[PDB]
Amino acid sequence: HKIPVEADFLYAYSTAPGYYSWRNSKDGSWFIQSLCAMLKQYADKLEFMHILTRVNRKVATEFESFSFDATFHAKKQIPCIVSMLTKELYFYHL
Amino acid sequence: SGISLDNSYKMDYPEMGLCIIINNKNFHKSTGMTSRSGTDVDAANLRETFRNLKYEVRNKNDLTREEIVELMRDVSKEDHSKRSSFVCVLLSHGEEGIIFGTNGPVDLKKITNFFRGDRCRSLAGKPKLFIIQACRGTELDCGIET
Amino acid sequence: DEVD
Ligand SMILES: [Cl-]
Ligand code: NA
Ligand code: NA
Ligand code: NA
C-alpha cells in the first residue's frame, strides 16, 4: 500500500566512489561521451541498465589518461550505476 | 483481456518528461575552482541525445548553489502528471556526495530529496534519473593490464 | 585530459 520514498531513483555516476572523474577539454568527459554514444546506438534496443553497462565497458576499455604529470598519467575510470529502480526502463514503448 | 505483466515502467505517458542539464563551466574566482573545459561539448551532446529521446530538455549554465537548489525545488513542484519520467544531468566539480555550484557546494541529497515519492507526488512510481559527471574524491585508478 |  506504500512505496519507499527513496524508491525509483537511479544515479548514473561517472566514476567509482572516492575517485576523480576524467574530462577531456576537447572531446568532453569520458562518461558523458560514452553515455550519449550508447543512448544513440541502443535506446531503441536495450533496457537502460544494459545500456549503462555498455557505458561502463566503453569508459573502462577505451579511455586512459595522458598527462605530463606522472601522478595523473595512464589512469583509468569505471563509472558506477546506482539503481533503486523497481522496474525495467525502456525509452521506447508499444 | 489476456494475461498482463508489469515488469517495466510505463513510458507511454503523453510526455517523456523533463531533462534538466546543469552545466557549470566557470566558477567564482573566490572558490579557487578551475574552469571545466570541454563541458560545453558534454552539454550539447546531452541536449541532442535526450532531444532524440523526446525529452523536454532545459539547459542551464553556470548556476550558483542558490540557483541550483531553487531550480530543483521549482522543478519538483511542477505538475509531472502527464510525464513518464524525470532526468537531471549535473556537470560540475564535485566530491563524494557533493556537486558544486559556481560559488560553493550543494549536497546531492538536498537536490534529490525534492523528488522523494512523498515530496513530488506526480513523479511517485516514475523513474527519476540523476546523471552525474563530477569527481567523487581524489583517488586515481592505476588500472591493470589485460 | 583533466580531472573534475
Ligand atoms: Cl567547453
Ligand atoms: Na567522465
Ligand atoms: Na561535463
Ligand atoms: Na517513486
CATH for B67: 3.40.50.1460
For this experimental structure, what is the resolution in angstroms? Answer: 1.9
Nearest CA in chain A to C3: A22
Please state, in angstroms and as integers, the Cα–Cα distance from residue A17 to each residue in A32, A74, B80, B114, following that order: 17, 19, 31, 23
Copy the grid coordinates of residue A34.
560514452
**Domains held by chain B: number:** 1
B133: amino acid identity, one letter: Q
Ion ligand 1 residues within 5 Å by Cβ: B 40
Collapse the DSSP code of A51 into the 3-class scheme (helix H, G, I; strand E, B; otherwise coil) and give the result: helix
Copy the grid coordinates of residue B137.
574524491
Distance A94 CA to ligand 4 centre (A): 23
- Identify the residue whose cell numbers are 541529497: B109
Distance A31 CA to ligand 2 centre (A): 4
State the Cα–Cα distance between residues B27 and B7, nearest whole angstrom.
43
Domain that holds residue B5: 1-146
The experimental technique behind this entry is: X-ray
State the Cα–Cα distance between residues B141 and A80, nearest whole angstrom.
14
Interface of C with B in 1-4 (CB under 8 A): 2-4
* Structural domains of chain A sorted by starting position, each given as residue range(s) with its CATH number in brackets: 1-94 (3.30.70.1470)
Interface check B127 vs A, CB under 8 A: yes
DSSP B32-72: TPPP-TTHHHHHHHHHHHHHHTT-EEEEEES--HHHHHHHH
Cβ within 8 Å, pair C4-B93: yes
Distance B37 CA to ligand 1 centre (A): 4
In what side-by-side order are the strands of the sheet with B104-107?
A: B94-95, B98-101, B104-107
Interface check A9 vs C, CB under 8 A: no
